[PDB]
């Protein structure tokens, strides 16, 4: 009624429609490498009137937790604001654990106000989370109704099927260094229609040193020699 609802016999029809909506069209690939995690997404603004340094697709929820998302950006804003508040509350309660990767699982679990209390209309965004404050990286996905999936490499766009196929065929693998971001950009290239540029592609990286949204300078540097 006023929660996550509309579940007929053996189905979650409203949730399935929400998942049809999160099919979206922003690929937003994620790769869990040995050194860290890369969350890269496509910012294909309509015309040149819009700006790319104004709004962002990758949001640092805390010191080393980075976030990328899928369709329904307005819902994603509220979700990332809630996630920031939740991570901050956890850090305040359990004071000074520098909680990122011992919190990445915890923040993913506390993404139950995300969907288990849907709010009449469930959220229409699936989001990938990266954290590296455990000596090991973490890539998790939370969908409009499910929970943490703990991916190693995935995509959540219009061509997420062939994007994931590209990820597995290109062997996301386990020995890959931090610079698997080249493979992430290649995976975006498959689900991209255009000469992708620094403002067109937004990527954040989360390594053991912390999380950082790569500026257009480094994004263009990586896009060069591709």
């Amino acid at each position: 009624f006023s929660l996550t609802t509309f579940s007929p016999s053996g189905k979650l029809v409203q949730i399935e429609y929400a998942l049809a909506a999160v099919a979206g069209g922003a690929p937003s690939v994620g790769i869990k490498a040995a050194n860290g995690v890369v969350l890269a997404t496509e910012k294909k603004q309509k015309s040149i009137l819009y700006d790319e340094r104004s709004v962002h697709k990758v949001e640092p929820i805390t010191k080393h937790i980075g976030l990328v998302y899928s369709g329904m950006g307005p819902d994603y804003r509220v979700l990332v604001h809630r996630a920031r508040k939740l991570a901050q509350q956890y850090y305040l309660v359990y004071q000074e654990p520098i909680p990122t990767a011992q919190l990445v699982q915890r923040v993913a679990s506390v993404m139950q106000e995300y969907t288990q209390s849907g709010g009449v209309r469930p959220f229409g965004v699936s989001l990938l989370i990266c954290g590296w404050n455990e000596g090991r990286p973490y890539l998790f996905q939370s969908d409009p109704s499910g929970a943490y999936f703990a991916w190693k490499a995935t995509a959540m766009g219009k061509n997420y099927v062939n994007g994931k196929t590209f990820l597995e065929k290109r062997y996301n693998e386990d020995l890959e260094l931090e610079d698997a971001i080249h493979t992430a950009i290649l995976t975006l290239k498959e689900s991209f229609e255009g000469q992708m540029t620094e403002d067109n592609i937004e990527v954040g990286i989360c390594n053991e040193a912390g999380f950082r949204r790569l500026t257009p300078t480094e994004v263009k540097d990586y896009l060069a020699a591709i």
Partner: protein
């Protein structure tokens, strides 16, 4: 059914209620143009005044939200005034909670969050009014943003809203693609000629109301009849 009647996800995977609410902005018969410049940001909308028994003094669609941020509303006037009041409340509350004045991007973000809460749930409905707010921001130059009945807050340099918003956006895209910065004469003239080419009445200097925020002069100047007439004379020269 009721997929297209309430704010619920469609079986095809869409949200039809906000899709209708956006066309609500086109309803009402008005257009507005926003042009960011090298140093200033100017916005202009037509002033459709049917019959002179109205007070042209108070029929405006542009307002001061704070001492440096000015908005223009597009759509149903009641929802427009409600969102203007909400924006003014947010600006004042931000100035009270935090000492420095509210950045225009943050104000647009808060308004978009309110609108996103509106498109969430089912008891209320989204407000059919798209707001374009501009203001000078330090270390940022002029800044223009658009909050929509959905909650997607963005828009920059040249952005328009209203019935014939697509044609204005196309012309402004042509102008911005022409790589030359607009001073505090070219920005205003560009906006005026954009809106005039959209709706050719040659714009007698009484049917539009332009708001300007420069860098050396802050504040949302609602330019008077004399100023708009002078700009029109200079442009048509």
């Amino acid at each position: 059914g009721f997929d297209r009647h309430i704010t619920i996800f469609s079986p095809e995977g869409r949200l039809y209620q906000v899709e209708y609410a956006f066309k609500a902005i086109n309803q009402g018969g008005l257009t507005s143009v926003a042009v960011r410049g090298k140093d200033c940001a100017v916005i202009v909308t037509q002033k459709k005044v049917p019959d002179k028994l109205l007070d042209s003094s108070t029929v405006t669609h542009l307002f001061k939200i704070t001492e440096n941020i000015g908005c223009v509303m597009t759509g149903m006037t009641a929802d427009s005034r409600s969102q203007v009041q909400r924006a003014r409340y947010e600006a004042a509350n931000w100035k009270y909670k935090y000492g420095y004045e509210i950045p225009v991007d943050m104000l647009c973000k808060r308004i978009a969050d309110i609108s996103q809460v509106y498109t969430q749930n089912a008891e209320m409905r989204p407000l059919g009014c798209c707001m374009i707010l501009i203001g000078i921001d330090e270390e940022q130059g002029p800044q223009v943003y658009k909050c929509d009945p959905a909650g997607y807050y963005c828009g920059f340099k040249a952005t328009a809203a209203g019935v014939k918003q697509t044609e204005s956006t196309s012309f402004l895209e042509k102008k911005v693609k022409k790589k030359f910065d607009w001073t505090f004469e070219q920005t205003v003239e560009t906006a005026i000629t954009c809106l005039s080419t959209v709706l050719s009445i040659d714009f007698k200097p009484s049917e539009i109301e332009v708001g300007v925020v420069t860098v050396e002069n802050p504040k949302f100047r609602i330019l008077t009849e004399a100023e708009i007439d002078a700009h029109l004379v200079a442009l048509a020269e």
